[PDB]
From a paper:
In H. pylori, Csd6 is one of the cell shape-determining proteins that play key roles in alteration of cross-linking or by trimming of peptidoglycan muropeptides. Csd6 is also involved in deglycosylation of the flagellar protein FlaA. A Csd6 monomer has a three-domain architecture consisting of the N-terminal domain (NTD; Val-13–Asn-56), the middle l,d-CPase domain (Lys-67–Glu-202), and the C-terminal nuclear transport factor 2-like domain (NTF2-like domain; Thr-209–Lys-330). Mass analyses using the synthetic muramyl peptides indicate that Csd6 functions only as the l,d-carboxypeptidase (l,d-CPase) and not as the l,d-transpeptidase (l,d-TPase).
To provide a structural basis of understanding the molecular function, the crystal structures of Csd6 have been determined, both in the ligand-free state (“Csd6-unbound”) and in the d-Ala-bound state (“Csd6-Ala”). Refined models of both structures are essentially identical to each other with an r.m.s. deviation of 0.17 Å for 632 eq Cα positions. In the case of Csd6-unbound structure, two monomers in the ASU were similar to each other with an r.m.s. deviation of 0.64 Å for 316 Cα atom pairs, except for the N-terminal residues (Leu-15–Asp-41) showing r.m.s. deviations greater than 1.0 Å with a maximum Cα deviation (7.6 Å) at Leu-15. The amino acid residues with the largest deviation encompass the entire helix αA and the N-terminal half of αB. In the crystal of Csd6, two possible models of the dimer could be identified. The dimer model I has a buried surface area of 1,080 Å2 per monomer (6.7% of the monomer surface area) at the interface, as analyzed by the PISA server. The dimer model II has a buried surface area of 726 Å2 (4.5% of the monomer surface area). After direct excitation leakage and buffer background corrections, the distance between Cy3 and Cy5 dipoles in the dye-labeled Csd6 dimer is estimated to be 107 Å from the corrected FRET efficiency (Ecorr ≈0.03), using Ro (Förster distance) of 60 Å for the Cy3 and Cy5 pair. In the crystal structure of Csd6-unbound, the distance between sulfur atoms of two Cys-176 residues is 96 and 66 Å in dimer models I and II, respectively. This result unambiguously favors model I, supporting the assignment of dimer model I in the crystal as the dimer in solution.
Residue numbers in the entry:
A (entry chain A), B (entry chain B): 15 to 330
Write the structure that this text describes.
Amino acid sequence: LNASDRLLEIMRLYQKQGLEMVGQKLDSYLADKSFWAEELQNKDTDFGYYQNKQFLFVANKSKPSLEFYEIENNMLKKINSSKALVGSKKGDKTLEGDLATPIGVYRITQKLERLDQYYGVLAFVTNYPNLYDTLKKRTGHGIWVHGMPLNGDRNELNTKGCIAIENPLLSSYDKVLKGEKAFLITYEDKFFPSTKEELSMILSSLFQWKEAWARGDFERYMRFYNPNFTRYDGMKFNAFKEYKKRVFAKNEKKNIAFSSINVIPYPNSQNKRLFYVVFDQDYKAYQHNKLSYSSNSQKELYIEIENNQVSIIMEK
Amino acid sequence: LNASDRLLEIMRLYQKQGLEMVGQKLDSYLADKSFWAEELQNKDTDFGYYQNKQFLFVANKSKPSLEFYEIENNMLKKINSSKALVGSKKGDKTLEGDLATPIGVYRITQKLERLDQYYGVLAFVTNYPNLYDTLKKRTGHGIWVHGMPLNGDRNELNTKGCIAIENPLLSSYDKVLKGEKAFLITYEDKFFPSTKEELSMILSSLFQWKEAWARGDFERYMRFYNPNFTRYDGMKFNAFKEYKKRVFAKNEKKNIAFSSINVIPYPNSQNKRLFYVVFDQDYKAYQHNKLSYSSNSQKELYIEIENNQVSIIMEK
C-alpha cells in the first residue's frame, strides 16, 4: 500500500462520500505505523523526525566535538564540525556546580552578545534544566554554547559545563541560523540513533493517543501512560488517572490537532530508548455544540520504547 | 516524488489548517485539467466519462444496430449487440409523426410491459424530446426501445421512430438493468468519440465554473456561457447575465456539491463538438450565517468545445 494508492483513495472518498469520511480516512493514516514507515523510508532520520526546517547542534562530550546541521524535508545537511571544550565531569549533569555538560536534548532559546570577552563572539543559551531535568529535580543553570576568549587566551582544557568552540566557526553558525531556534543533542560516548521503526511507532502512537483523548476513550488513553508518569506540574500517575477518569466521564466533544511535530532521540545515562516529542497543539472542547474552551500551546512529551511498547513518562 | 509530496501536503494541511482546507485543496485538483488527464489515461473514454456505475445503449441508425454496455470505473463491458429496426426518415427527428429515430443522447426513464403484442416483451421509454430537443422546439413523443411482435409477425422493414430488437435479447438487457436508468447514444453514420483531451477540458471547466459560482466571481462565471445561451425556461444570455449580476452582487455565502457526474459526447447534424453533462447537485445558500435556501436537483448542461474553448449553450 503506497502514496499513490492513498491519494487515489482520498479523492475517491471525497467524490463519493464527501469531506467527513475523508477526515476519518486521514485519521486512519495518521494512526497507522505502515503509513509513517512509507513516508520515512528515504529520509535522514538518525537525529529524529522534524516536520519543518530546523537547525541541529550535536555535541559529543567524550571527544569532545560539536557538529552543526540544517534539516529540511527531513534531509540533513552538515554545515560543519570542530573540536570543543566541555565540562570536566563525566556523565549526567544533576546538580548546580557539578561541572558537567548535560546529556540530552535541549533548545537554544536566545543569543547573548554583551558578555565578558572570555565568552567570545556570542553565547547561545540552552534551556538546561529542560522539562525532563526539572521533573527529575536536577539543579543548576547557565549552560551555553559560546566562543573562545577574544584576547586569544587559551588557559583551560575544560569549561564548568558550557560548550565552547572557535569564534569564526561560531559566527558562521550564527549567520546560517538568522535568529532561528536550534536544537542541541548532547551525548557522551556513543550515539544511538532513532530508527525508522522507532519513529513509526512513536508517530502512530502519538496520533492514536490524540484521538483516544479527543473521543474520550479513557481506557485506551490511559494505556499510553507509563506507571512512572509525571506531569509538568509534578502530578503523578494515580492522581492523574483519578482526575482524567472524572474529566472523560463528562463526555464533552473535543477536536485536537498536532502540527510542527518533532520527535528526537534523547541520550541518557541508562541508554533507555527515550524520545523528546514537541509540537503545536490546537485544542477545542464543546458543551452542547457551543465552544467552551480553546487553546493553542506548545506541548512536550518524553516517551520511552521498552518491551516493544510506546509509553509517556512525562507530559507538558 | 510527486505522489509522496502531494500526499504529505494534504496530511500537513489537515493538521495545521483543518479538514475544510483539505476540501479546498481536493477542489483545486478537480479544477485542474492535468489532474483529469492523469485520472482518465487508462479509462474507456470514447462514450464519455461516467463517475459512477452506469448502463449505456449505443444505436447506430445507419446499420442499423444496438449495443449494450455496463460501465464501472469508466471501463466498458459490452453485454451484447444486434441488428435493429429504426425509423425510416434519415436525419433528425424534429416533429410529431416524422418517422425519424432521433440523433443525440437520451435517457431511459421507465419500462412498459402491459403492451400491444406488436411491441414484444417490453418497452424502454426514452426521454425524447430531451432538453436540447425541447429548446430547439422539436416535437413528438413515444420514442421507445422495444421488442418484436409476440404473434411472430416480422413484416415491417422500419418502425415509426422506435428502436426494435429481438425479444430474447431485450429481456436479457432488462435482467441486467434490474430497474436502473440507462443512457442511450444514437448516431447516424459515423460516431466521433469524446477524447480524453475533450473530457479533461470539460471536467476541469465544470469544477472551475462551480467554484466561480459558489465564491461569487461574476466575471469568471459568466465567461463559461456561450453568447447563444438558452436557459431551460427560455431565458437568453443578456437577461441571464443581468439577473446573475444582481444575484452575485448580494455576495451570499453558498456551498455547492456535485456528484454522479456524466459527460457524454452528443452526436449532431453539423458534427460540432457538443456534450451532455448531467449530475446531481446539493446547493445551499446562507444569510448572516443562517441557511436561507437549500435544494437537491439533477442539473443538465449542454456544452460546446469550439476553437479549443469550453462554453455552456444550455443549462437546467
